[PDB]
Protein backbone atom coordinates (compact mmCIF):
# COMPACT_ATOMS: atom_id res chain seq x y z
CA UNK A 1 0.00 0.00 0.00
CA UNK A 2 1.32 3.45 1.08
CA UNK A 3 5.11 3.62 0.70
CA UNK A 4 5.60 7.45 0.59
CA UNK A 5 8.50 8.83 2.69
CA UNK A 6 7.45 10.12 6.14
CA UNK A 7 6.72 9.25 9.78
CA UNK A 8 4.13 6.53 10.51
CA UNK A 9 2.22 5.23 13.55
CA UNK A 10 2.41 1.50 14.35
CA UNK A 11 -0.99 0.33 15.57
CA UNK A 12 -2.64 -2.93 16.75
CA UNK A 13 -6.26 -4.16 17.01
CA UNK A 14 -5.29 -7.01 19.48
CA UNK A 15 -5.96 -5.07 22.70
CA UNK A 16 -9.09 -2.88 23.39
CA UNK A 17 -9.91 -0.58 20.43
CA UNK A 18 -7.00 0.59 18.24
CA UNK A 19 -3.79 0.94 20.29
CA UNK A 20 -0.59 2.70 19.21
CA UNK A 21 2.41 0.47 20.04
CA UNK A 22 5.05 2.68 18.38
CA UNK A 23 6.24 4.86 15.48
CA UNK A 24 8.52 4.42 12.43
CA UNK A 25 10.26 6.07 9.45
CA UNK A 26 9.56 5.25 5.82
CA UNK A 27 12.58 6.12 3.66
CA UNK A 28 13.58 4.74 0.24
CA UNK A 29 10.86 2.01 0.40
CA UNK A 30 12.16 0.79 3.80
CA UNK A 31 10.22 1.01 7.06
CA UNK A 32 12.53 1.59 10.06
CA UNK A 33 11.38 1.15 13.65
CA UNK A 34 12.58 -0.09 17.09
CA UNK A 35 12.71 -3.86 17.66
CA UNK A 36 10.66 -3.73 20.88
CA UNK A 37 7.76 -2.06 18.96
CA UNK A 38 7.02 -4.98 16.56
CA UNK A 39 9.20 -7.85 18.04
CA UNK A 40 10.09 -8.61 14.37
CA UNK A 41 6.46 -9.35 13.42
CA UNK A 42 5.00 -8.60 9.94
CA UNK A 43 3.24 -5.26 9.36
CA UNK A 44 0.26 -4.24 7.23
CA UNK A 45 -0.11 -1.04 5.13
CA UNK A 46 -3.67 -1.18 3.83
CA UNK A 47 -3.91 -4.27 1.61
CA UNK A 48 -0.09 -4.61 1.38
CA UNK A 49 2.22 -6.62 3.65
CA UNK A 50 5.61 -5.48 5.06
CA UNK A 51 8.02 -8.32 5.87
CA UNK A 52 11.02 -7.84 8.21
CA UNK A 53 14.39 -7.73 6.44
CA UNK A 54 17.01 -6.99 9.10
CA UNK A 55 16.77 -6.88 12.91
CA UNK A 56 18.90 -6.91 16.07
CA UNK A 57 17.64 -7.06 19.73
CA UNK A 58 20.78 -5.41 21.18
CA UNK A 59 20.77 -2.39 18.85
CA UNK A 60 16.92 -2.47 19.32
CA UNK A 61 16.41 -1.81 15.59
CA UNK A 62 14.45 -3.48 12.74
CA UNK A 63 13.91 -2.73 9.00
CA UNK A 64 11.10 -3.81 6.63
CA UNK A 65 11.21 -4.43 2.86
CA UNK A 66 14.97 -3.69 2.69
CA UNK A 67 18.23 -2.95 4.47
CA UNK A 68 18.57 -0.09 7.03
CA UNK A 69 18.81 3.23 5.03
CA UNK A 70 19.29 5.88 7.72
CA UNK A 71 22.94 6.90 8.20
CA UNK A 72 22.88 10.55 9.47
CA UNK A 73 24.71 11.23 12.75
CA UNK A 74 24.49 13.79 15.56
CA UNK A 75 27.43 16.22 15.33
CA UNK A 76 27.95 16.25 19.14
CA UNK A 77 27.33 20.02 19.35
CA UNK A 78 24.00 21.06 17.89
CA UNK A 79 20.42 20.94 19.10
CA UNK A 80 18.13 18.38 17.47
CA UNK A 81 14.38 17.88 17.07
CA UNK A 82 12.42 14.88 18.27
CA UNK A 83 9.51 14.59 15.78
CA UNK A 84 7.36 13.03 18.51
CA UNK A 85 4.22 11.21 17.35
CA UNK A 86 2.30 10.48 20.63
CA UNK A 87 -0.75 8.15 20.77
CA UNK A 88 -3.96 9.94 19.70
CA UNK A 89 -2.05 13.21 19.27
CA UNK A 90 -0.62 15.07 16.23
CA UNK A 91 3.08 14.86 15.15
CA UNK A 92 5.00 17.53 17.10
CA UNK A 93 8.62 18.77 16.78
CA UNK A 94 10.45 19.31 20.09
CA UNK A 95 13.90 20.94 19.97
CA UNK A 96 16.47 19.98 22.63
CA UNK A 97 20.22 19.78 23.22
CA UNK A 98 21.14 16.12 23.65
CA UNK A 99 23.25 14.90 26.54
CA UNK A 100 25.66 11.93 26.31
CA UNK A 101 25.56 8.25 27.30
CA UNK A 102 29.14 7.23 28.16
CA UNK A 103 29.57 3.45 27.53
CA UNK A 104 32.56 0.99 27.54
CA UNK A 105 32.23 0.95 23.68
CA UNK A 106 31.96 4.73 23.12
CA UNK A 107 29.66 7.71 23.55
CA UNK A 108 26.10 8.04 22.18
CA UNK A 109 23.87 11.13 22.09
CA UNK A 110 20.80 11.10 24.35
CA UNK A 111 17.57 13.11 24.50
CA UNK A 112 15.95 13.82 27.88
CA UNK A 113 12.28 13.94 26.84
CA UNK A 114 9.50 11.88 28.49
CA UNK A 115 6.58 10.45 26.43
CA UNK A 116 4.08 7.49 26.50
CA UNK A 117 5.97 4.25 25.54
CA UNK A 118 3.85 4.08 22.31
CA UNK A 119 5.97 7.08 21.12
CA UNK A 120 9.08 4.70 20.70
CA UNK A 121 10.32 4.75 17.09
CA UNK A 122 9.76 8.53 16.65
CA UNK A 123 12.65 10.03 14.63
CA UNK A 124 15.25 12.46 15.95
CA UNK A 125 16.31 14.99 13.29
CA UNK A 126 19.17 17.32 12.53
CA UNK A 127 18.78 20.95 11.20
CA UNK A 128 18.62 19.45 7.65
CA UNK A 129 15.65 17.17 8.40
CA UNK A 130 17.89 14.06 8.18
CA UNK A 131 17.08 11.23 10.59
CA UNK A 132 20.04 10.91 12.99
CA UNK A 133 18.37 8.17 15.09
CA UNK A 134 15.21 6.84 16.73
CA UNK A 135 13.77 7.64 20.17
CA UNK A 136 12.57 4.90 22.54
CA UNK A 137 15.56 3.14 24.12
CA UNK A 138 17.27 4.53 27.17
CA UNK A 139 17.30 4.71 30.92
CA UNK A 140 15.20 5.71 33.97
CA UNK A 141 16.79 8.39 36.17
CA UNK A 142 16.33 9.24 39.95
CA UNK A 143 13.13 11.31 39.48
CA UNK A 144 11.42 8.43 37.58
CA UNK A 145 11.85 10.32 34.24
CA UNK A 146 13.27 8.79 30.98
CA UNK A 147 16.40 9.71 28.95
CA UNK A 148 16.43 7.97 25.53
CA UNK A 149 19.54 7.31 23.44
CA UNK A 150 19.76 8.59 19.84
CA UNK A 151 19.70 5.03 18.32
CA UNK A 152 21.06 4.83 14.76
CA UNK A 153 21.61 1.77 12.54
CA UNK A 154 24.34 1.06 10.02
CA UNK A 155 23.93 1.45 6.23
CA UNK A 156 25.66 -1.40 4.31
CA UNK A 157 27.95 -0.70 1.26
CA UNK B 1 -1.77 -8.10 13.11
CA UNK B 2 0.06 -4.77 13.35
CA UNK B 3 -0.55 -1.99 10.81
CA UNK B 4 0.96 1.39 9.84
CA UNK B 5 -0.68 4.84 9.28
CA UNK B 6 1.05 7.95 7.89
CA UNK B 7 1.43 10.66 10.53
CA UNK B 8 3.36 13.32 8.55
CA UNK B 9 6.48 14.55 6.75
CA UNK B 10 9.93 14.38 8.33
CA UNK B 11 10.83 18.10 8.49
CA UNK B 12 12.68 20.43 10.85
CA UNK B 13 10.33 23.10 12.31
CA UNK B 14 11.75 26.59 12.90
CA UNK B 15 10.62 28.07 16.25
CA UNK B 16 9.52 24.71 17.65
CA UNK B 17 9.02 24.35 21.46
CA UNK B 18 12.60 24.07 22.96
CA UNK B 19 12.66 21.94 26.15
CA UNK B 20 14.75 19.31 28.01
CA UNK B 21 18.18 19.17 29.61
CA UNK B 22 21.50 17.48 28.39
CA UNK B 23 22.64 14.97 31.08
CA UNK B 24 25.97 13.09 30.83
CA UNK B 25 25.27 9.57 32.15
CA UNK B 26 27.46 6.50 32.69
CA UNK B 27 25.44 3.62 31.17
CA UNK B 28 25.78 -0.14 30.39
CA UNK B 29 24.06 -2.00 27.53
CA UNK B 30 23.20 -5.70 27.97
CA UNK B 31 22.59 -8.53 25.41
CA UNK B 32 18.81 -7.86 25.62
CA UNK B 33 19.35 -4.27 24.34
CA UNK B 34 18.39 -2.79 27.73
CA UNK B 35 20.31 0.16 29.21
CA UNK B 36 21.17 0.55 32.88
CA UNK B 37 22.82 3.30 34.98
CA UNK B 38 26.40 2.51 36.04
CA UNK B 39 27.31 3.67 39.56
N1 LIG C 1 9.36 8.27 28.05
C1 LIG C 1 9.52 7.15 27.86
C2 LIG C 1 9.78 5.74 27.62
C3 LIG C 1 9.79 4.86 28.69
C4 LIG C 1 10.07 3.52 28.48
C5 LIG C 1 10.32 3.04 27.20
C6 LIG C 1 10.54 1.57 27.02
O1 LIG C 1 10.12 0.79 27.87
N2 LIG C 1 11.33 1.19 25.99
C7 LIG C 1 11.81 -0.13 25.72
C8 LIG C 1 11.02 -1.23 26.02
C9 LIG C 1 11.48 -2.52 25.78
C10 LIG C 1 12.77 -2.69 25.31
C11 LIG C 1 13.57 -1.60 25.01
C12 LIG C 1 13.13 -0.30 25.27
C13 LIG C 1 14.90 -2.08 24.49
N3 LIG C 1 14.90 -3.48 24.93
C14 LIG C 1 13.51 -3.96 24.97
C15 LIG C 1 10.25 3.92 26.12
C16 LIG C 1 10.02 5.27 26.32
CL1 LIG C 1 9.92 6.32 24.94
mmCIF file of C-alpha atoms and ligand atoms in Angstrom:
data_model
loop_
_atom_site.group_PDB
_atom_site.id
_atom_site.type_symbol
_atom_site.label_atom_id
_atom_site.label_comp_id
_atom_site.label_asym_id
_atom_site.label_seq_id
_atom_site.Cartn_x
_atom_site.Cartn_y
_atom_site.Cartn_z
ATOM 1 C CA UNK A 1 0.000 0.000 0.000
ATOM 2 C CA UNK A 2 1.317 3.449 1.085
ATOM 3 C CA UNK A 3 5.112 3.623 0.705
ATOM 4 C CA UNK A 4 5.601 7.453 0.594
ATOM 5 C CA UNK A 5 8.500 8.828 2.689
ATOM 6 C CA UNK A 6 7.448 10.124 6.136
ATOM 7 C CA UNK A 7 6.716 9.251 9.777
ATOM 8 C CA UNK A 8 4.128 6.531 10.515
ATOM 9 C CA UNK A 9 2.223 5.230 13.552
ATOM 10 C CA UNK A 10 2.410 1.498 14.351
ATOM 11 C CA UNK A 11 -0.990 0.331 15.570
ATOM 12 C CA UNK A 12 -2.642 -2.926 16.747
ATOM 13 C CA UNK A 13 -6.256 -4.161 17.008
ATOM 14 C CA UNK A 14 -5.287 -7.010 19.479
ATOM 15 C CA UNK A 15 -5.960 -5.071 22.703
ATOM 16 C CA UNK A 16 -9.093 -2.882 23.389
ATOM 17 C CA UNK A 17 -9.914 -0.581 20.425
ATOM 18 C CA UNK A 18 -7.003 0.591 18.245
ATOM 19 C CA UNK A 19 -3.793 0.937 20.294
ATOM 20 C CA UNK A 20 -0.585 2.695 19.214
ATOM 21 C CA UNK A 21 2.414 0.474 20.039
ATOM 22 C CA UNK A 22 5.054 2.679 18.383
ATOM 23 C CA UNK A 23 6.243 4.862 15.484
ATOM 24 C CA UNK A 24 8.522 4.416 12.435
ATOM 25 C CA UNK A 25 10.259 6.070 9.454
ATOM 26 C CA UNK A 26 9.558 5.249 5.822
ATOM 27 C CA UNK A 27 12.584 6.124 3.660
ATOM 28 C CA UNK A 28 13.578 4.737 0.241
ATOM 29 C CA UNK A 29 10.860 2.014 0.402
ATOM 30 C CA UNK A 30 12.159 0.794 3.796
ATOM 31 C CA UNK A 31 10.216 1.005 7.058
ATOM 32 C CA UNK A 32 12.525 1.592 10.059
ATOM 33 C CA UNK A 33 11.382 1.153 13.653
ATOM 34 C CA UNK A 34 12.581 -0.088 17.090
ATOM 35 C CA UNK A 35 12.708 -3.859 17.663
ATOM 36 C CA UNK A 36 10.664 -3.728 20.881
ATOM 37 C CA UNK A 37 7.759 -2.056 18.956
ATOM 38 C CA UNK A 38 7.025 -4.982 16.564
ATOM 39 C CA UNK A 39 9.196 -7.849 18.041
ATOM 40 C CA UNK A 40 10.093 -8.605 14.374
ATOM 41 C CA UNK A 41 6.457 -9.352 13.415
ATOM 42 C CA UNK A 42 5.002 -8.597 9.937
ATOM 43 C CA UNK A 43 3.237 -5.258 9.359
ATOM 44 C CA UNK A 44 0.262 -4.235 7.231
ATOM 45 C CA UNK A 45 -0.112 -1.044 5.128
ATOM 46 C CA UNK A 46 -3.672 -1.181 3.827
ATOM 47 C CA UNK A 47 -3.906 -4.266 1.605
ATOM 48 C CA UNK A 48 -0.090 -4.610 1.376
ATOM 49 C CA UNK A 49 2.218 -6.616 3.646
ATOM 50 C CA UNK A 50 5.606 -5.483 5.057
ATOM 51 C CA UNK A 51 8.016 -8.322 5.874
ATOM 52 C CA UNK A 52 11.019 -7.837 8.210
ATOM 53 C CA UNK A 53 14.395 -7.735 6.439
ATOM 54 C CA UNK A 54 17.006 -6.985 9.103
ATOM 55 C CA UNK A 55 16.772 -6.879 12.912
ATOM 56 C CA UNK A 56 18.902 -6.906 16.074
ATOM 57 C CA UNK A 57 17.637 -7.057 19.734
ATOM 58 C CA UNK A 58 20.784 -5.405 21.181
ATOM 59 C CA UNK A 59 20.765 -2.389 18.852
ATOM 60 C CA UNK A 60 16.921 -2.469 19.324
ATOM 61 C CA UNK A 61 16.408 -1.811 15.586
ATOM 62 C CA UNK A 62 14.454 -3.480 12.742
ATOM 63 C CA UNK A 63 13.910 -2.730 9.002
ATOM 64 C CA UNK A 64 11.100 -3.815 6.631
ATOM 65 C CA UNK A 65 11.213 -4.429 2.864
ATOM 66 C CA UNK A 66 14.966 -3.694 2.693
ATOM 67 C CA UNK A 67 18.230 -2.952 4.467
ATOM 68 C CA UNK A 68 18.567 -0.092 7.034
ATOM 69 C CA UNK A 69 18.808 3.234 5.026
ATOM 70 C CA UNK A 70 19.290 5.878 7.721
ATOM 71 C CA UNK A 71 22.941 6.897 8.198
ATOM 72 C CA UNK A 72 22.882 10.546 9.465
ATOM 73 C CA UNK A 73 24.706 11.231 12.749
ATOM 74 C CA UNK A 74 24.495 13.795 15.561
ATOM 75 C CA UNK A 75 27.433 16.222 15.333
ATOM 76 C CA UNK A 76 27.953 16.247 19.144
ATOM 77 C CA UNK A 77 27.334 20.024 19.355
ATOM 78 C CA UNK A 78 24.003 21.057 17.894
ATOM 79 C CA UNK A 79 20.423 20.940 19.103
ATOM 80 C CA UNK A 80 18.133 18.375 17.474
ATOM 81 C CA UNK A 81 14.379 17.877 17.067
ATOM 82 C CA UNK A 82 12.417 14.877 18.267
ATOM 83 C CA UNK A 83 9.513 14.594 15.779
ATOM 84 C CA UNK A 84 7.356 13.030 18.510
ATOM 85 C CA UNK A 85 4.223 11.214 17.351
ATOM 86 C CA UNK A 86 2.302 10.478 20.625
ATOM 87 C CA UNK A 87 -0.749 8.155 20.774
ATOM 88 C CA UNK A 88 -3.961 9.940 19.702
ATOM 89 C CA UNK A 89 -2.048 13.211 19.271
ATOM 90 C CA UNK A 90 -0.624 15.071 16.234
ATOM 91 C CA UNK A 91 3.082 14.860 15.145
ATOM 92 C CA UNK A 92 5.001 17.527 17.096
ATOM 93 C CA UNK A 93 8.623 18.774 16.779
ATOM 94 C CA UNK A 94 10.448 19.313 20.094
ATOM 95 C CA UNK A 95 13.899 20.942 19.973
ATOM 96 C CA UNK A 96 16.470 19.977 22.630
ATOM 97 C CA UNK A 97 20.220 19.780 23.223
ATOM 98 C CA UNK A 98 21.136 16.118 23.653
ATOM 99 C CA UNK A 99 23.250 14.895 26.539
ATOM 100 C CA UNK A 100 25.657 11.934 26.305
ATOM 101 C CA UNK A 101 25.557 8.249 27.299
ATOM 102 C CA UNK A 102 29.136 7.230 28.159
ATOM 103 C CA UNK A 103 29.570 3.450 27.535
ATOM 104 C CA UNK A 104 32.565 0.987 27.536
ATOM 105 C CA UNK A 105 32.229 0.946 23.682
ATOM 106 C CA UNK A 106 31.958 4.725 23.120
ATOM 107 C CA UNK A 107 29.655 7.712 23.548
ATOM 108 C CA UNK A 108 26.103 8.041 22.177
ATOM 109 C CA UNK A 109 23.868 11.132 22.089
ATOM 110 C CA UNK A 110 20.803 11.102 24.353
ATOM 111 C CA UNK A 111 17.571 13.112 24.496
ATOM 112 C CA UNK A 112 15.946 13.824 27.879
ATOM 113 C CA UNK A 113 12.277 13.940 26.839
ATOM 114 C CA UNK A 114 9.502 11.875 28.493
ATOM 115 C CA UNK A 115 6.582 10.455 26.425
ATOM 116 C CA UNK A 116 4.075 7.485 26.504
ATOM 117 C CA UNK A 117 5.970 4.251 25.544
ATOM 118 C CA UNK A 118 3.851 4.083 22.313
ATOM 119 C CA UNK A 119 5.969 7.079 21.121
ATOM 120 C CA UNK A 120 9.082 4.698 20.703
ATOM 121 C CA UNK A 121 10.324 4.749 17.086
ATOM 122 C CA UNK A 122 9.763 8.527 16.647
ATOM 123 C CA UNK A 123 12.646 10.033 14.629
ATOM 124 C CA UNK A 124 15.251 12.457 15.951
ATOM 125 C CA UNK A 125 16.308 14.994 13.294
ATOM 126 C CA UNK A 126 19.174 17.320 12.532
ATOM 127 C CA UNK A 127 18.783 20.949 11.202
ATOM 128 C CA UNK A 128 18.615 19.450 7.646
ATOM 129 C CA UNK A 129 15.651 17.169 8.398
ATOM 130 C CA UNK A 130 17.889 14.059 8.183
ATOM 131 C CA UNK A 131 17.075 11.235 10.592
ATOM 132 C CA UNK A 132 20.039 10.914 12.991
ATOM 133 C CA UNK A 133 18.373 8.166 15.086
ATOM 134 C CA UNK A 134 15.206 6.844 16.728
ATOM 135 C CA UNK A 135 13.769 7.637 20.174
ATOM 136 C CA UNK A 136 12.574 4.902 22.541
ATOM 137 C CA UNK A 137 15.562 3.139 24.121
ATOM 138 C CA UNK A 138 17.273 4.532 27.167
ATOM 139 C CA UNK A 139 17.297 4.714 30.916
ATOM 140 C CA UNK A 140 15.195 5.714 33.971
ATOM 141 C CA UNK A 141 16.788 8.388 36.175
ATOM 142 C CA UNK A 142 16.335 9.237 39.951
ATOM 143 C CA UNK A 143 13.128 11.311 39.477
ATOM 144 C CA UNK A 144 11.424 8.426 37.577
ATOM 145 C CA UNK A 145 11.846 10.315 34.238
ATOM 146 C CA UNK A 146 13.275 8.789 30.981
ATOM 147 C CA UNK A 147 16.400 9.706 28.951
ATOM 148 C CA UNK A 148 16.429 7.971 25.530
ATOM 149 C CA UNK A 149 19.537 7.307 23.438
ATOM 150 C CA UNK A 150 19.760 8.588 19.841
ATOM 151 C CA UNK A 151 19.698 5.034 18.322
ATOM 152 C CA UNK A 152 21.063 4.832 14.759
ATOM 153 C CA UNK A 153 21.606 1.775 12.544
ATOM 154 C CA UNK A 154 24.343 1.058 10.015
ATOM 155 C CA UNK A 155 23.926 1.448 6.235
ATOM 156 C CA UNK A 156 25.663 -1.405 4.311
ATOM 157 C CA UNK A 157 27.952 -0.699 1.259
ATOM 158 C CA UNK B 1 -1.767 -8.099 13.112
ATOM 159 C CA UNK B 2 0.057 -4.765 13.354
ATOM 160 C CA UNK B 3 -0.552 -1.986 10.808
ATOM 161 C CA UNK B 4 0.958 1.392 9.845
ATOM 162 C CA UNK B 5 -0.680 4.840 9.279
ATOM 163 C CA UNK B 6 1.046 7.949 7.895
ATOM 164 C CA UNK B 7 1.427 10.660 10.533
ATOM 165 C CA UNK B 8 3.359 13.317 8.552
ATOM 166 C CA UNK B 9 6.481 14.552 6.746
ATOM 167 C CA UNK B 10 9.926 14.379 8.330
ATOM 168 C CA UNK B 11 10.832 18.096 8.488
ATOM 169 C CA UNK B 12 12.677 20.431 10.851
ATOM 170 C CA UNK B 13 10.331 23.096 12.310
ATOM 171 C CA UNK B 14 11.754 26.588 12.904
ATOM 172 C CA UNK B 15 10.617 28.071 16.252
ATOM 173 C CA UNK B 16 9.518 24.706 17.654
ATOM 174 C CA UNK B 17 9.025 24.349 21.457
ATOM 175 C CA UNK B 18 12.599 24.072 22.958
ATOM 176 C CA UNK B 19 12.658 21.937 26.153
ATOM 177 C CA UNK B 20 14.755 19.310 28.009
ATOM 178 C CA UNK B 21 18.184 19.168 29.613
ATOM 179 C CA UNK B 22 21.498 17.483 28.395
ATOM 180 C CA UNK B 23 22.639 14.968 31.083
ATOM 181 C CA UNK B 24 25.968 13.094 30.827
ATOM 182 C CA UNK B 25 25.269 9.574 32.148
ATOM 183 C CA UNK B 26 27.458 6.503 32.695
ATOM 184 C CA UNK B 27 25.439 3.623 31.166
ATOM 185 C CA UNK B 28 25.781 -0.145 30.393
ATOM 186 C CA UNK B 29 24.062 -2.005 27.530
ATOM 187 C CA UNK B 30 23.203 -5.698 27.975
ATOM 188 C CA UNK B 31 22.593 -8.527 25.415
ATOM 189 C CA UNK B 32 18.807 -7.857 25.619
ATOM 190 C CA UNK B 33 19.354 -4.265 24.343
ATOM 191 C CA UNK B 34 18.390 -2.789 27.729
ATOM 192 C CA UNK B 35 20.312 0.162 29.205
ATOM 193 C CA UNK B 36 21.167 0.550 32.881
ATOM 194 C CA UNK B 37 22.821 3.299 34.984
ATOM 195 C CA UNK B 38 26.403 2.511 36.038
ATOM 196 C CA UNK B 39 27.306 3.674 39.560
HETATM 197 N N1 LIG C 1 9.361 8.272 28.054
HETATM 198 C C1 LIG C 1 9.521 7.147 27.857
HETATM 199 C C2 LIG C 1 9.775 5.743 27.616
HETATM 200 C C3 LIG C 1 9.786 4.859 28.690
HETATM 201 C C4 LIG C 1 10.067 3.522 28.477
HETATM 202 C C5 LIG C 1 10.321 3.044 27.197
HETATM 203 C C6 LIG C 1 10.543 1.572 27.023
HETATM 204 O O1 LIG C 1 10.119 0.787 27.865
HETATM 205 N N2 LIG C 1 11.329 1.188 25.987
HETATM 206 C C7 LIG C 1 11.815 -0.126 25.721
HETATM 207 C C8 LIG C 1 11.021 -1.231 26.023
HETATM 208 C C9 LIG C 1 11.478 -2.516 25.781
HETATM 209 C C10 LIG C 1 12.772 -2.691 25.308
HETATM 210 C C11 LIG C 1 13.571 -1.596 25.010
HETATM 211 C C12 LIG C 1 13.130 -0.304 25.268
HETATM 212 C C13 LIG C 1 14.898 -2.077 24.491
HETATM 213 N N3 LIG C 1 14.900 -3.477 24.930
HETATM 214 C C14 LIG C 1 13.508 -3.956 24.969
HETATM 215 C C15 LIG C 1 10.251 3.916 26.116
HETATM 216 C C16 LIG C 1 10.018 5.268 26.324
HETATM 217 CL CL1 LIG C 1 9.915 6.324 24.944
#
